[PDB]
Design a protein around this ligand. Structure first.
Ligand SMILES: Cc1c(Cl)c(OCC(=O)N2CCN(C)CC2)nc2sc(C(=O)NC3CC3)c(N)c12
Ligand SMILES: C[N+](C)(C)CC#CCOC1=NOCC1
Lengths: 338, 56, 217, 278, 236
């Protein structure tokens, strides 16, 4: 009954592929022929942020679209004004291998994590002046890959031992463990209503989970190699996905399948960052050949490139009003584009 | 102990077998309706004049 | 100018830029060494031969005013290709390979590990100081057994020095870049001369960086 | 016709090749941020010292030598020659501090990035420029106010203290002689401090490039000094052809500089091809 | 908690010199900006001195400048006001104030308890008037006070640098409203403030017996910072 359970799994995934084929009645670019394109979208560097020394690994905007967190491997997690390019905090980490960062929707807390297997939660609005390590969450065994805040009270993390988790901050205890991946999960993105979230791992399988129940709702497997970045559509019903086979695909939640693959023949190196615009018409993708491609979300054509980095872009994100897109590479500079 | 692994695996499989899947025409349709309704206030493809771009 | 009182804010910005600069200097005096190797290669023996939370075990010590950070990363039970791109800017990969390479095959496994880690796209110019432990065990193992079990195409004597130089050339033949190099040593009876070897080898790497950084190379 | 026009075309050729080479080195540190460190700051210093020579010091000498005399008056020639010498000595001074920088980088490797910062490199470039200034400018712009007269006529233009012997000895040993022997003794020190010391390119490349640097600097800067020293006594044995070829091959130092100091660096050549592919 | 304990006052002879020492304990003192603010035995506040973080810039009031000096010993975390040539217009209570500045910070958030300098008997600043003298209040009611500047305060960056303090009787001044609408941290929510350009107002809704005292507005657009006269509230 071991191979009987195996062939039963084959039976159910073949009927899933049957349902995905039977619900597929068109292609996406069958419908994009009527909508007029966007043309050349050139964007200038408005600010550059020369603060770090080692390579930058993560960036995250603030919900008032002005402040900014960058976490970089000089052992420094520094938060930034962006209108007048000041630095408003510089927090020295404990372990100088940091592969993620996060910034609270209320703007009070900053999460951090890396190869220390420990997600730290820094308070910012302390009465005593400076910042203090308020919580120190330590439950995984692999490294950390992405952290996001639901509110000031619970944080969902993604790890290197194939698991994700949801922590309660004020207790410091692993409230929920999500598992079901077969490789290292390397991205994370909440819904805009924060009811449910996706995570993409090193086995090309972006899984959609829900934070309230505690186990996987949907699975999407379209890529050929390791998923490295995920962002949602702004309506919450779709999400893009970049991987290290130089392509980035777009999946729907209700249609349960791939919809469109942005991949140009000139490109050979993978993604490190995917985001959207405010309306969702654009898509922003980082790369390893040191430039960032703007894509159409519908017409699948390259609408402009944002080059200007001596090393590969490792973080990217637009604000919550669509005004600017920040990016940050391993050259320690962190650019802003309009 | 492998049969319990396969048991929870096929549990997940038949639990994801029962989700409604609409036609992709309506999915691309309301994606297009969303981008059309929200492209009036997207400051990237319809670029903002520098009276109100705060990164001037 | 016309700044209202946020010139105090840019004073704060200049102050913490100064602090970032000073800590960057103070951490740039350090010398970082990533220690690699397979499981049971003897790397715990060389890290206890330095005489000074389970992801990365760090060992900071110092010797002749050289702060050696030594990152032992063998606790990271995952795929290496997702965190060795943060271990560039290290100045050496210490590499330990045991000399009992006959069983569950090991020196073939250590050989594949070595030429996967030295032909890696990030370590294309970082130089591998290479250690080779368990040498008296190798002496007894050639005193009774042939290690042509590991090397079927080997020609030569069954003595210690020739076999040592043969496996040393086998390891040194695995690199292909001209601007990096491999040092070699034997250990496991060495009472802290290997730390002196680490010191002189890393001074050789630092003067080579100072040569090809100042354009004289 | 043909003689003066092909001389003026090869003159403008070397002038324009020199200035585009130095401005490409200048932008290769300005447009790049990976190369921007202290040793490329000293090569930026050599670049801004040779920029002044590339702008006006070669073409004006060649229009002078196809005219045969100074037609512009005794203030234009003495201030032009004043700035020309002082920036030539500025170039050789920052080249000397480049050599001192390389000696302390190799011989005291673990300590020389600790014993200096960007302020120290600023101290050394500023000391080089002002030491060149206090060497050449008062001795060339006060000398008619010392002797009372202008000993040079309005026809030709040349150093006014050329009839002297002691002060030309004292400035020609100062600007060139002890710099070149100091540079060669510490480059031999570098040549034997860059040894493997444990057990083929390792000393081969360093000996080769310092022999290239030293030989280029000697053959581009020696014979002006020996002509200006023997011309204090052996005046009528000296024609103008030796002056012609001497300044010429001393002015080619500014075009041989970047292919000996900058384009020996591999990443500099890579950024040179980056700016050759934009 | 955080502590600002200052000392060095007394019945001191005029024309001489004194020293005031503010010892601060409970926070990272070396990253704060420090103000010294005095106030008369009958009149309102007035700014006296300010030293930034790391002793970068030092600003004085023009009626005091030259005569006094201000310094800090951040390994000792103390703040010194060394005052010379003391006239009879310096008889005042003096407060040590911490005013950290970055984007979104709350300056003047915490105040010392004041020491007294009672000595014997021996120009285009942005003047700011509180036109109200004092009104009678009662619990259960809501009441709004006003403060009119001379120059418009809404600087080009989009801010409006007006601060509302409350000093309780026999206590130290708390901070109520920072930058004309942002509420302070720890103050109850029943206060609010707004205004436009030059004329501003503070609406306290559902007044209680704890919220009676004197209320000062203060600009922060440029140095010097001058306070209003301060309207007093009184119960029944
Ligand atoms: C450096 C220099 C000196 Cl010091 C010099 O000195 C000439 C001199 O002292 N006397 C004194 C005796 N009188 C008959 C006149 C000649 N004369 C020249 S001519 C020249 C050049 O470049 N001539 C060009 C036309 C070929 C020079 N660089 C040069
Ligand atoms: C280059 N040229 C020789 C034509 C001008 C000059 C000069 C003087 O500069 C110094 N002499 O000895 C070394 C520097």
């Amino acid at each position: 009954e071991l191979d009987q359970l195996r062939q039963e799994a084959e039976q159910l995934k073949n009927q899933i592929r049957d349902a995905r084929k039977a619900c597929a009645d068109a292609t996406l670019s069958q419908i994009t022929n009527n909508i007029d394109p966007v043309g050349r979208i050139q964007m200038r560097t408005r600010r550059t942020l020369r603060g770090h020394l080692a390579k930058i690994y993560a960036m995250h905007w603030g919900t008032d679209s002005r402040l900014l967190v960058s976490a970089s491997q000089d052992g420094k997690l520094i938060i930034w004004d962006s209108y007048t390019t000041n630095k408003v905090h510089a927090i020295p980490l404990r372990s100088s291998w940091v592969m993620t960062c996060a910034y609270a929707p209320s703007g009070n807390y900053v999460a951090c994590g890396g190869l220390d297997n420990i997600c730290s939660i820094y308070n910012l609005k302390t009465r005593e002046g400076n910042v203090r390590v308020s919580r120190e969450l330590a439950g995984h065994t692999g490294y950390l890959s992405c952290c996001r805040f639901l509110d000031d009270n619970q944080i969902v993390t993604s790890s290197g031992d194939t698991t994700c988790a949801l922590w309660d901050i004020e207790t410091g205890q692993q409230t929920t463990t999500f598992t079901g991946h077969t490789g290292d999960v390397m991205s994370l993105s909440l819904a805009p209503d924060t009811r449910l979230f996706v995570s993409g791992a090193c086995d090309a399988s972006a899984k959609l989970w829900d934070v309230r129940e505690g186990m996987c709702r949907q699975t999407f497997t379209g890529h050929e190699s390791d998923i490295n970045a995920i962002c949602f559509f702004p309506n919450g019903n779709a999400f893009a996905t970049g991987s290290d086979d130089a392509t980035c695909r777009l999946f729907d939640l209700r249609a349960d399948q791939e919809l469109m693959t942005y991949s140009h023949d000139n490109i050979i190196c993978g993604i490190t960052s995917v985001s959207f615009s405010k309306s969702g018409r654009l898509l922003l993708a980082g790369y390893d050949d040191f430039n960032c491609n703007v894509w159409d979300a519908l017409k699948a054509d390259r609408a402009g490139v944002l080059a200007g980095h001596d090393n590969r872009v490792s973080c990217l994100g637009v604000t919550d009003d669509g005004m600017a897109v920040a990016t940050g590479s391993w050259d320690s500079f962190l650019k802003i584009w309009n | 102990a492998s049969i319990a692994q396969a048991r929870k695996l096929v549990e997940q499989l038949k639990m994801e077998a029962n989700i409604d899947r609409i036609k992709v025409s309506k999915a691309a349709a309301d994606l297009m309706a969303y981008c059309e309704a929200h492209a009036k206030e997207d400051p990237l493809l319809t670029p903002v004049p520098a009276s109100e771009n705060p990164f001037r | 100018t016309l700044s209202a009182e946020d010139k105090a804010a840019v004073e704060r910005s200049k102050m913490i830029e100064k602090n970032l600069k000073e800590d960057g200097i103070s951490a740039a005096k350090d010398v970082k060494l990533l220690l690699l190797g397979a499981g049971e290669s003897g790397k715990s023996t060389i890290v206890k031969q330095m005489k000074i939370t389970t992801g990365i075990v760090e060992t900071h010590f110092t010797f002749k005013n050289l702060h050696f950070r030594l990152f032992d990363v063998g606790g990271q039970r995952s795929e290496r290709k997702k965190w060795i791109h943060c271990f560039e800017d290290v100045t050496a990969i210490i590499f330990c390979v045991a000399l009992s390479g006959y069983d569950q095959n090991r020196m073939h496994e250590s050989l594949m590990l070595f030429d996967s880690i030295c032909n890696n796209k990030f370590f294309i110019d970082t130089s591998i100081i290479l250690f080779l432990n368990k040498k008296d065990l190798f002496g007894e193992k050639i005193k009774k057994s042939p290690l042509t079990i590991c090397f079927p195409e080997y020609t030569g004597p069954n003595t210690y020095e020739d076999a040592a130089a043969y496996i040393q050339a086998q390891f040194e033949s695995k690199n292909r870049s001209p601007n990096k190099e491999i040092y070699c040593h034997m250990t496991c009876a060495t009472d802290t001369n290997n730390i002196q070897v680490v010191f002189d080898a890393v001074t050789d790497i630092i003067i080579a960086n100072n040569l090809r950084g100042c354009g004289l190379y | 016709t043909f003689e003066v026009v092909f001389i003026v075309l090869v003159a403008g050729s070397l002038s324009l090749v020199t200035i585009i080479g130095n401005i490409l080195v200048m932008v290769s540190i300005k447009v790049n941020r990976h190369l921007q460190t202290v040793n490329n700051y000293f090569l930026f210093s050599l670049a801004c010292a040779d920029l002044i020579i590339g702008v006006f010091s070669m073409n004006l000498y060649t229009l002078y030598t196809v005219i045969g005399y100074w037609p512009l008056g005794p203030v234009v020639c003495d201030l032009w020659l004043a700035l020309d010498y002082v920036v030539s000595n500025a170039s050789v001074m920052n080249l000397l501090i480049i050599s001192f920088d390389r000696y302390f980088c190799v011989t005291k490797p673990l300590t020389y990035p600790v014993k200096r910062t960007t302020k120290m490199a600023g101290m050394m470039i500023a000391a080089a420029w002002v030491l060149s200034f206090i060497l050449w400018a008062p001795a060339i712009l006060f000398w008619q106010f010392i002797v009372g007269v202008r000993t040079v006529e309005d026809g030709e233009c040349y150093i006014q203290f050329f009839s002297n012997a002691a002060v030309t000895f004292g400035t020609a040993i100062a600007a060139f002689y002890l710099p070149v022997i100091i540079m060669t003794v510490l480059y031999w020190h570098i040549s034997r401090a860059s040894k493997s010391r444990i057990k083929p390119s390792r000393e081969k490349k360093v000996t080769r490039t310092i022999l290239a640097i030293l030989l280029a600097f000697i053959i581009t800067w020696a014979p002006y000094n020996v002509m200006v020293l023997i011309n204090t006594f052996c005046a009528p044995c000296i024609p103008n052809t030796v002056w012609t070829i001497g300044y010429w091959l001393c002015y080619i130092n500014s075009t041989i500089n970047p292919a000996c100091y900058a384009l020996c660096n591999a990443t500099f050549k890579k950024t040179f091809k980056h700016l050759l592919m934009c | 908690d955080v502590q600002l304990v200052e000392s060095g006052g007394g019945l001191v002879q005029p024309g001489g010199s004194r020293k005031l020492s503010c010892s601060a304990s409970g926070f990272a003192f070396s990253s704060f900006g420090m103000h010294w603010v005095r106030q008369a035995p009958e009149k309102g506040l007035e700014w006296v001195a300010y030293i930034s973080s790391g002793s970068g810039t030092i600003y004085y009031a023009d009626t005091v400048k030259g005569r006094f000096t201000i310094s800090r010993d951040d390994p000792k975390n103390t703040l010194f006001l060394q005052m010379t040539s003391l006239r009879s217009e310096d008889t005042a209570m003096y407060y040590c104030v911490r005013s950290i500045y970055y984007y979104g910070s709350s300056p003047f958030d915490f105040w010392g308890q004041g020491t007294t300098l009672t000595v014997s008997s021996g120009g285009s600043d942005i003047v700011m008037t509180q036109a109200t003298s004092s009104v009678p209040v009662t619990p259960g009611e809501s009441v709004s006070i006003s403060c009119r500047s001379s120059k418009s305060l809404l600087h080009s960056n989009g801010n409006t640098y007006l601060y509302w303090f409350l000093q309780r009787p026999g206590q130290s001044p708390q901070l109520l409203i920072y930058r004309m609408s942002n509420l302070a941290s720890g103050v109850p929510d029943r206060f609010s403030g707004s205004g436009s350009g030059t004329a501003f107002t503070l609406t306290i809704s559902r007044l209680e017996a704890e919220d009676v005292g004197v209320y000062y507005c203060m600009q922060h657009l440029e140095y010097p910072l001058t306070f209003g006269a301060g309207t007093k509230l009184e119960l029944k």
